[PDB]
Enzyme design. Sequence first.
Site, PDB file in Angstrom:
ATOM      1  N   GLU A 111       0.806  -1.219   0.000  1.00  0.00           N
ATOM      2  CA  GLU A 111       0.000   0.000   0.000  1.00  0.00           C
ATOM      3  C   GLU A 111       0.843   1.275   0.000  1.00  0.00           C
ATOM      4  O   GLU A 111       0.304   2.382  -0.030  1.00  0.00           O
ATOM      5  CB  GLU A 111      -0.951   0.003   1.199  1.00  0.00           C
ATOM      6  CG  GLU A 111      -2.013  -1.085   1.139  1.00  0.00           C
ATOM      7  CD  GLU A 111      -3.050  -0.957   2.237  1.00  0.00           C
ATOM      8  OE1 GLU A 111      -2.846  -0.144   3.163  1.00  0.00           O
ATOM      9  OE2 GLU A 111      -4.074  -1.670   2.172  1.00  0.00           O
TER      10      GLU A 111
ATOM     11  N   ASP B 204      -4.892   8.988  -3.988  1.00  0.00           N
ATOM     12  CA  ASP B 204      -4.793   7.590  -4.387  1.00  0.00           C
ATOM     13  C   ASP B 204      -5.527   7.353  -5.705  1.00  0.00           C
ATOM     14  O   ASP B 204      -5.870   8.303  -6.411  1.00  0.00           O
ATOM     15  CB  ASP B 204      -5.335   6.671  -3.287  1.00  0.00           C
ATOM     16  CG  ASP B 204      -6.836   6.792  -3.103  1.00  0.00           C
ATOM     17  OD1 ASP B 204      -7.400   7.860  -3.426  1.00  0.00           O
ATOM     18  OD2 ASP B 204      -7.452   5.816  -2.626  1.00  0.00           O
TER      19      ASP B 204
END
EC number: 3.2.1.17
Length: 900
Positions: free
Chosen positions: A731, A740
């Site tokens: 991540e 993101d």
Amino acid sequence: FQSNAMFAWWGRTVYQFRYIVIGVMVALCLGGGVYGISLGNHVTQSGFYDEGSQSVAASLIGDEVYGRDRTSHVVAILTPPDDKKVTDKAWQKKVTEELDQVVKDHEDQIVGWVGWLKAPDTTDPTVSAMKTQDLRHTFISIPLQGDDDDEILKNYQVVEPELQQVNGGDIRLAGLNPLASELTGTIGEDQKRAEVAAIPLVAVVLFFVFGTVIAAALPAIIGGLAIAGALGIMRLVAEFTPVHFFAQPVVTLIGLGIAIDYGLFIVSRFREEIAEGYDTEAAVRRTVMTSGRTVVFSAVIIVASSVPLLLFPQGFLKSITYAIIASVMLAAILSITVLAAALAILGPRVDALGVTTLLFWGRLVNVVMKRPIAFAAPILVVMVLLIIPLGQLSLGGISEKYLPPDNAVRQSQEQFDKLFPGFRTEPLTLVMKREDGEPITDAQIADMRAKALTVSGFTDPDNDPEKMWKERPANDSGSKDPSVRVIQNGLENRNDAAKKIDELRALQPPHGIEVFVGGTPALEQDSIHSLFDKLPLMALILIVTTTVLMFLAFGSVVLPIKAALMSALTLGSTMGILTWMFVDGHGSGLMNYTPQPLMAPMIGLIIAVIWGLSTDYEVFLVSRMVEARERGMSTAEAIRIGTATTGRLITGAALILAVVAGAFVFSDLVMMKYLAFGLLIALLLDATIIRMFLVPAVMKLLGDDCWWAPRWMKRVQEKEFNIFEMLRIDEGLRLKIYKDTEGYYTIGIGHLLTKSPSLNAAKSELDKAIGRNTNGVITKDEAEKLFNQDVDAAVRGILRNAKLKPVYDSLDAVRRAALINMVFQMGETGVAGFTNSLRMLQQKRWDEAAVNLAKSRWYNQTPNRAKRVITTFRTGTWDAYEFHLGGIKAFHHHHHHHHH
Ligand SMILES: CCCCCCCCCCCCO[C@@H]1O[C@H](CO)[C@@H](O[C@H]2O[C@H](CO)[C@@H](O)[C@H](O)[C@H]2O)[C@H](O)[C@H]1O
Ligand SMILES: CCCCCCCCCCCCO[C@@H]1O[C@H](CO)[C@@H](O[C@H]2O[C@H](CO)[C@@H](O)[C@H](O)[C@H]2O)[C@H](O)[C@H]1O
Ligand SMILES: CCCCCCCCCCCCO[C@@H]1O[C@H](CO)[C@@H](O[C@H]2O[C@H](CO)[C@@H](O)[C@H](O)[C@H]2O)[C@H](O)[C@H]1O
Ligand SMILES: CCCCCCCCCCCCO[C@@H]1O[C@H](CO)[C@@H](O[C@H]2O[C@H](CO)[C@@H](O)[C@H](O)[C@H]2O)[C@H](O)[C@H]1O
Ligand SMILES: CCCCCCCCCCCCO[C@@H]1O[C@H](CO)[C@@H](O[C@H]2O[C@H](CO)[C@@H](O)[C@H](O)[C@H]2O)[C@H](O)[C@H]1O
Ligand SMILES: CCCCCCCCCCCCO[C@@H]1O[C@H](CO)[C@@H](O[C@H]2O[C@H](CO)[C@@H](O)[C@H](O)[C@H]2O)[C@H](O)[C@H]1O
Ligand SMILES: CC(C)=CCC/C(C)=C/CNCCN[C@H]1[C@@H]2C[C@H]3C[C@@H](C2)C[C@@H]1C3
Ligand SMILES: NC(=O)CN(CC(=O)O)CC(=O)O
Ligand SMILES: NC(=O)CN(CC(=O)O)CC(=O)O
């Protein structure tokens, strides 16, 4: 550095270029082997003396001026067929004409033939002595061409076939060259005996170690590539420096067994990894990082045990040292290049072909553990009483006795010395060199003779000391330089050599003349002296380096002192036995050899060989005990761990080595048997007495004290991989606010701040989360803590979920992290959908769950991350994250983003 860092790099590099690596190295090994078959004609028989000794100097000066002796090259006993006597003029003429024909046909090899048979009507007492008085035998001398002993022997071997047919074949050949051809001829016999008796025996042993053809064949192929390559290297070495005959069998005796042992260890490890659940690529790397590391370090130990031999001036030992180093290094390299690459191409197919195709030890330790002194003290005494026949050794040079007593060439020489006594001599020489360059007068010679007669113990057949110390004969190869004179005389007792040599060297030379005491006894004794004069330093260097390396491998201060104790014990015990066998002759009649003085260089070699053998086997055994202890086991247990999984490998390694050495104990060369036996003994002594009895008993002297060093011991922090580093990869880790894949403001490790389009709103959330004015920026620590609280939130939810709490509780800490990883990515309700796969994980059916999880849509959308998590489920280690594929271009915020 000092870390699996480079082994990890190579372990993955060798897999990736598995085709290039396996091609280049095989090409080089085969190419070298082809180049290495010419080594046989570029080897020397010289190197048993000290080139820098006074005796060698005496020989050089002596041969320069008087010419090298060629009367001993070939000696040939002729015997008339039908009980005829040598006086038979008809027989004399046929044999003579046969001899003239051989000389006529081989003038590049033969100088001529000399004897009574050439002048039967002579008044010369010595020439007349070249026939027995029964007139049934006579001998001739056949001096050969050549400017060194290697060249001379080759000239002999050229003319030998035709020379052997003289006198209807009833001609017995003896002397230097027939004996040298027989002694060097033992090499091929031992090679062929290994190729036929040892190879299939090793193949069988290997096939009973692995149940598979491919897995058993791989170590054998490695050994064959090692021998080929090593001989090619030794052939290359020959281009710069003399290589001894004895180097070739050493490559096979020592190199082959070690190479196969290396291959056996690595292939065996590769199979463990495969069975543990790792795929081919990972299994290859883990094998190199562990076993490959053990192999390389093993090679270092053996090299460090061989190098001290270079302190010895004998070329014999230097060639062998080069041979050992070349063999062991190449063996180690091949096992982590060709072999690794082969496994990388084969994978699980190393077990594809099985037998069908060509067709509480563990408490025994405890017994001694509980009863340490019940086993130690007797053995500790027994192995010392085996040292007491080491105080009784004799040392000599090379003779016909090095061959078996039933050998035809040895017996011919023994017949010659029987039929013609006195002709064979080994006198001490006084080589006089006048420094000014002017002729040596008869006064100075008479002076030296007088001082020589001062010393007693020299022969006197003519009963007149005026006829002692006669001048050495001169031939046409001699310079006849008047500034050099040589007188010589033989000893009555040859065992007085060392002492009489010193007395001759104690005398005072006349009128400024250098006097060099030489002769074969001097050459031998000087060589004997040179080796034991340097043995202490060699021993010190040997012990220190092996101990220092064990400080590094163990991290202990006692264990290396302990192992030195063990090796010195198994050494002195082994050499005491060898002396009992070859000097005292126990086993002589059974094994068909002659009890005789040993050879000093073979002692230096066997010391290094036995020491490195003992050190290498104990390092592998102990190093692991140590790992168990660091792992948290008890002193008594760490030992149990150690002995039990080194057990099958050590015995499998000792056995294969024993097979190879066992083929060499049948050598007709007595010093070869000495070496091969020394192997078997020390090997057997370590595979049983030392490892299974002494070591554990002599490890209980204390519980926790043998593991002790100051803070100068290994850090082994272990960067124990954690769940933080795990999801840092999956991540990402960002210290500044970013968007993101969904365009949401995120920070740290996938921590969603807000779904608001406003950056200042995200900064608002971050400031409240971290507890300060962040301005969108946090530290790694703040990111780690933030990550932790998210993990805690995920766990609380998992434990709140009745579909996830049972499987979570059942899992180990590493697999728990993998489950948390899934919850982060898709959420609890998503993970709970894998009902069957979760049940499999709960039942520890790792392989089935791994197979089932790959069939998911989750694997389809995110294959790289899924495969990482799934692998973790299969193995229960961090291996999939400690070494991963780069990239990770898309970051996405996770579920369970904890808020304040
Ligand atoms: C790596 C695992 C496999 C190992 C295989 C090793 C392969 C052996 C090397 C390939 C062949 C080398 O070929 C050989 O090299 C040396 C180069 O010094 C040459 O030797 C040359 O150098 C020496 C230096 O004093 C001279 O004495 C010599 O007169 C000269 O010719 C040989 O004439 C050549 O035949
Ligand atoms: C590995 C171990 C090797 C073992 C080596 C054993 C080899 C033994 C060699 C025996 C040498 C015999 O060599 C023999 O010696 C005598 C002298 O002593 C020589 O005889 C020569 O000297 C004598 C006098 O000294 C002269 O009168 C004569 O004209 C001349 O021929 C013979 O020509 C020679 O054939
Ligand atoms: C396994 C392969 C390794 C190669 C093995 C070595 C084989 C070649 C060496 C065999 C002979 C040893 O070396 C040789 O020894 C004998 C005595 O010890 C010497 O011979 C000397 O003594 C003999 C009598 O004993 C005399 O007759 C002779 O005149 C004298 O030179 C040689 O000068 C020496 O060259
Ligand atoms: C993938 C290939 C697997 C196998 C590759 C290994 C190749 C090398 C194995 C054999 C070793 C080299 O080949 C070896 O050379 C020498 C000379 O040529 C031969 O030996 C020759 O000289 C020696 C001493 O110099 C004598 O004792 C012997 O009487 C003579 O025949 C050996 O008997 C032979 O075995
Ligand atoms: C820690 C590193 C471990 C790996 C070391 C690898 C081994 C390489 C070291 C080679 C040593 C140098 O090798 C050097 O040349 C030869 C080789 O016999 C030796 O031999 C010396 O005496 C012999 C007599 O036999 C002479 O023929 C030679 O001319 C002479 O140099 C030298 O004493 C040595 O100085
Ligand atoms: C790893 C540990 C290594 C162990 C350390 C070794 C150090 C020991 C040093 C002992 C020194 C021995 O010294 C050596 O002894 C032998 C006899 O035994 C002598 O040898 C002499 O006597 C014997 C018997 O009479 C003869 O067979 C021999 O031909 C002769 O040279 C040597 O001339 C001498 O140099
Ligand atoms: C030639 C000179 C100077 C010494 C002898 C050299 C010799 C035979 C050392 C013994 N060691 C070799 C094989 N040892 C094997 C190898 C596989 C596996 C793990 C290691 C490495 C320990 C065991 C079990
Ligand atoms: N990975 C899974 O559990 C997929 N399962 C879904 C489920 O167990 O409900 C179907 C299957 O096992 O074939
Ligand atoms: N590796 C990436 O950039 C994106 N990833 C997704 C992820 O890491 O969650 C795709 C994958 O792992 O297959």
